[model samples]
Target: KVLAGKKLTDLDPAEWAKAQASAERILVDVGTGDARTAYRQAIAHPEWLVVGVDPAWQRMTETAVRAARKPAKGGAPNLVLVSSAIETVPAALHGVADEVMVLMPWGKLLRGVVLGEADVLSGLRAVAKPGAPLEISIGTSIWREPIPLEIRDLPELTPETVVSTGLTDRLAALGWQVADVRLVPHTDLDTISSSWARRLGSGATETVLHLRAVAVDPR
Candidate 1:
């Protein structure tokens, strides 16, 4: 998984500012290794704050914790670290975050991709305001490809390792209006960066979709 890719460090600062401009509070799903750099980028914006959540605490460095906790200059602590899953976000944070980002939802996402039964998106919906956006990027092409048996029998496993169009329609039905979806390319810049680029690239074999949805009034 290129979840720890170097391209994270290569994001367009200008474009990133645009994403964080309206974020009074933001939630980034997983912060692994030195991934805090990405969150730091968001925090650097004027008043946007970021919350990073991940169960794998061992992977988060002490420096990250301290940095994440400190209030930015002339601003409230622009970032917080929460060690939990998407299903456990506190109600207070709900609708407070303007952006929710997920880099590696994997089988959790595919459960929605292949089976359409997972609560991943709905859980995200719970935390977002009516107009807040949930940003998701996950491997779909993998589930459509050959998979080794060693990793095939998991709870949300798919026979193939790629995502399909039928699966996409299922996501649309789940209320995630597809904003972007494409293949992940094999590149040297690390998985996330290359994958993100390839997803928006002209040619790639693996499909990694970027989906966004706005919460609407429910019946």
Candidate 2:
């Protein structure tokens, strides 16, 4: 499905393929809330097509509605929203993305990220073209925020956690090669535009962790 200019259209296979072939690159922002990252990315890089996927569609309605307008009126044809959960990525998106971004994750998304849950990681890799870059931004807020009721345990998100928890190995198994994981100031989280990301920035005590990986075909 595609949301364009205030209307929801059933994404035709041919049209989707055309859209994929025309773009210089494709960036899929998983767990995209409100889709501001994808919208901003599309507007900023006309060479790229940005698709935002999330479990809920309503969160991005206003943004999609706005994106449906003509370019002069603030619509971005290169941006689209796919309402789907990262746990089960759509077949239409398989191996189509040149890059993937996940920022300020919470709830199910947060759990999957910190732990490198197999389903979530596999689903994400399914949409990535080989060697595609994957960037994730998450705050250490897990130490403060109550453990999501849906989750039983959550370790403090950090560079070390990724290493100590064997998450690195998990990702590597799923065709993602971990290049680096570092803790940075929220201000350094320059590319993502999530409201939750902003919340992490406003507090000086907060630390943001970024994990960089690239997709590979795991033999």
**TM-score top scorer:** 2
Candidate 1's displacement at residue 31, Å, is 6.7
lDDT of 2 by residue, 107-183 (tens): 78878877788888888899998989989887655577565654446557668778888899999988999999998
What's model 2's lDDT at 179? Answer: 98
Candidate lDDT (C-alpha), each: 0.48, 0.80
Query: In model 2, which regions exceed 4 Å deviation?
Result: 5-7, 150-152, 186-190, 195-206
- Counted clashes in each candidate structure: 17, 1
Candidate 1: minimum summed lDDT over ten consecutive residues — where? 1-10
Candidate 2: give the clashing pairs.
5-68
Q: Model 1: per-residue lDDT, tens digit, 1-219?
A: 111211112324464455456556565554233444344444455365565655554444442544534464322344444555555555544665566676545434434434544366555656666666666555544444474243355333332322453544554555555455444445322344322112343443344555555555432
Error of 1 at 112 (Å): 4.9
State in Å the error of residue 34, model 1.
Answer: 5.8
Q: With candidate 2 superimposed using the best TM-score fit, by how many Å does residue 156's alpha carbon deviate from the native?
A: 0.7
